[PDB]
Symmetry: D2
Subunit: 292 residues, 4 copies
């Protein structure tokens, strides 16, 4: 199954007490597939509030997402953790469910050496037999991997490439030059145009949950060399993103889902659970200006 | 029970497969009480490899530590997590076991606002009824809290004070000036002396597992104003600490315990699980030079 | 005079004792005009080793460069300094010589407030009557300016826009969206393609002194939407740039000029004055692979 | 001449047009010697607004300060610069004037290598014959030097030691341990007591221009092991420093001088030249509360 193209980092619907809302999660899945027209979903990432949840809740989300999506789209499962044993258990579970690849954040909190990081990736690959996408988010992790270190990771033939979330476009270009057959997915929705200009293979993003029509246009127009039109759409996109960021990233994408009839629910504590009223009204203005 | 003074951040003995070795953990607890002469233990911290473990393994460690220590010393339970529900569970369990206070790292990975951080501490306190020590480790977390924000936290009368792990001695002074009745424990063993000189009430540290004799000397000498002698002992301490850092922090402490007949075991993956033989030889030298 | 397009940040030829070599400086100017075919020169920038020079040497350089260039190309004079009186004197001097615009790095070393920064720019403009390009280099200065702050600066109608040297392509897009009539010059040669893709009006770079042919191709092909060809040329460019960076930035561009008969001379202490022999040999290899 | 103890980093009196006010500079010098009772002055440092001035103005300040001080106190001349030639010129001039040591900030703006930094210090020393104090201000410079690199610097017997301005108390202890006969001056007035507790030999500070009496008490009491009394005075000191930082550092110290009849003048552009009237009223309050 082809892993190129547009992937929404799946948001999860929670109840007021923080439990999974299965019905709302299925609506979010459906909405991405049928209305956003994504190539795939990236499940259990930062956007899914993954790192605030129990092992059992993560399994529950993997199960529901796969069940609802079936085989209509590609699915990637993020299974990384500071706990390698949890990561292996999640990796085997997602592999058994039929996820097309695994993905794993570089281990965080502690300051791990590069050979520890490589051993972590190799252990998950070995225990699962599945493909791996290296998940690079230096602004959250403080972890910075170079071209040579990426080459050492790529010695494992099950490693397909990297979800690139740093804003280093020098490194991005260097990685594409050095490993032309390895894949890169851009992680930053608001920099999609420059990233596609350097030949990334795809994008994984939180805003595609509500703006997937514009995201695909930016990406495909860029790759066809229609820059003038891609740029205009990127501009409107970034007006939307700038508002969503100022209003509260995850809550505001959820409120934009709710405004389209999707039961996207609350956020999970310790994140703020629901918008204040004025921030509800602000989300409505964003809906009216950009998504109507 | 008095929470002032010298607290070892408890190391945990693991088997080759990463399971807890109960017999070893009990030897480590017994050695801190009987040989290091600590005032208490801080259990489930960074030092105990906490964030690489399952919830069940965390509970197991709390239980064992408490069972072995009984009521001879004070015990503090670190129950913080990106998962607030897990933090509440562990907080209730440790409270039922009779830990004298909880502690909790500020939630991490995601970028939480300060009112989220305050709500997180307030929720743990309300659900457990226990005391709370705010756990500040900016070099691992990327989280920086100010004097005013500490004031907001301290509006909850069950918040006793802070485990201070930043090296900002201006902030440390400002906090003691503003909240003279709240407690500060120094978190950096190699800066014990300047921290004690500013009136911190205790220290919580990984190296006190093998250097607890000198740590108590530095701390009590400094508070008595014997700076000349405190400094000499800090100098030797930091020769030892420099060596430990260079050889691998957790593994070298465990090697140093092993050399005194404590079965301190392996470290937990994804950390390197055991020292290479030259690193074992290096640890023997530190032993011969500083702890014989 | 039109300030769009390709500007080399002018390197300066120094003698062994650090004095300016006027014959060499003239050769570097002539080479840029006739062989690199640049639209202009940006004189007195970082690349010119400007900050290691006295006010007299700076004046000497402005006059030689203008005298040699005459009116064949556009010229911009970087006159910024921690000393505002020096910046004014240089700004008047360069204006009198007929430079087409001034430019000034944000004041550095001290932490200036934004209103101090704005006042600095307004003072230089008022004293000289000339146009001003805001010079933004956060990796050298530690200074970060936002979209709103750029808008306050742009209230002065003599401010033309900004030499952008941060790698923040979100900010770059947001600046183009907000102030569509103000100009942006990219400052990072190795990210020229992504920057052009977002509509920048030009580039100012150290490497255009030797690679100005490829630099113009990347820029013009990108603007025409020929991304596939622009990317190939950016790849080869970045092979050259990676080698130049590893070998020593300014020294290696000078050595690559020398290999084309230009007496680009020494660097100025406290920079290392000349390459070691092996680094000379390395620059020869770069010349053979990329510039023959 | 003995270079231990308490040094005010000397403020400079400017007129409304930025020229040096000689009469005012002399009043500041006199006030530090007679009223603050300092062991010496550190002239041409960050506090003296040095880096905003021309070479001639710097010379003028060295000459005036030395003339006014004569031989009553120790004098250190800061002569560092991104321009090594200006550094050598100023170093020779100050040496000829009879300054007891030079000092030079690590070269900044460009990212110099360590061998370049060492060659810079060695050149200044060789051209002047004078002593050198290495001036370490990482929060302004972005430059971080380690224990081994300080040892390489100290191979030059004319390098006396270091003005320490990082808040890294581990590095401070390590430097005293490794080079017990080399001197350290604390750079951070608000961290005086913990620095003195680690055996620093002296302190160089901006606030000693108005709080010299307290600064000497903190330092001498700490060295005598009267920590309880030292801490009280550090507390009051840091209430004053906090106010001064909030209100505007250099302008508020000058306002505090003016309230004692010292004509401390304006600040030099591009710093804000004078306080607003509410900030004047604020400074009067600091004077009433802490310096009456």
């Amino acid at each position: 199954k082809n892993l190129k193209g547009i992937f929404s980092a799946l948001l999860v619907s929670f109840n007021a007490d923080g439990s999974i809302n299965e019905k709302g999660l299925r609506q979010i899945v459906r909405y991405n597939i049928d209305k956003m027209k994504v190539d795939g979903l990236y499940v259990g990432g930062s956007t899914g509030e993954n790192f605030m949840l129990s092992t059992e809740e993560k399994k529950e989300i993997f199960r529901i997402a796969k069940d609802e999506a079936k085989d209509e789209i590609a699915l990637i499962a993020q299974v990384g953790s500071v706990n390698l044993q949890e990561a292996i258990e999640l990796g085997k579970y997602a592999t058994e469910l039929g996820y097309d690849s695994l993905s794993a954040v570089t281990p965080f909190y502690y300051k791990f050496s590069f050979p520890e990081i490589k051993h972590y990736y190799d252990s998950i690959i070995e225990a699962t037999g599945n493909y791996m996408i290296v998940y690079s988010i230096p602004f959250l992790t403080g972890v910075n991997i170079g071209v040579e270190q990426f080459g050492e990771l790529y010695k494992n033939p099950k490693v397909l490439g990297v979800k690139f979330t740093a804003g280093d476009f020098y490194l991005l270009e260097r990685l594409k030059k050095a490993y032309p057959n390895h894949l890169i997915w851009a992680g930053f929705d608001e920099m999609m145009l420059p990233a596609a200009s350097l030949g990334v293979d795809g994008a994984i993003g939180s805003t595609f949950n509500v703006n997937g029509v514009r995201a695909r246009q930016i990406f495909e127009l860029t790759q066809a060399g229609k820059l003038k039109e891609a740029l205009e759409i990127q501009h409107v996109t970034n007006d939307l993103i700038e508002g969503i960021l100022a209003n509260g990233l995850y809550l505001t994408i959820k409120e934009l889902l709710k405004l389209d009839g999707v039961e996207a629910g609350y956020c999970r504590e310790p994140m703020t659970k629901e918008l204040s009223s004025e921030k509800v009204a602000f989300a409505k203005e964003l809906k009216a200006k950009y998504l109507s």
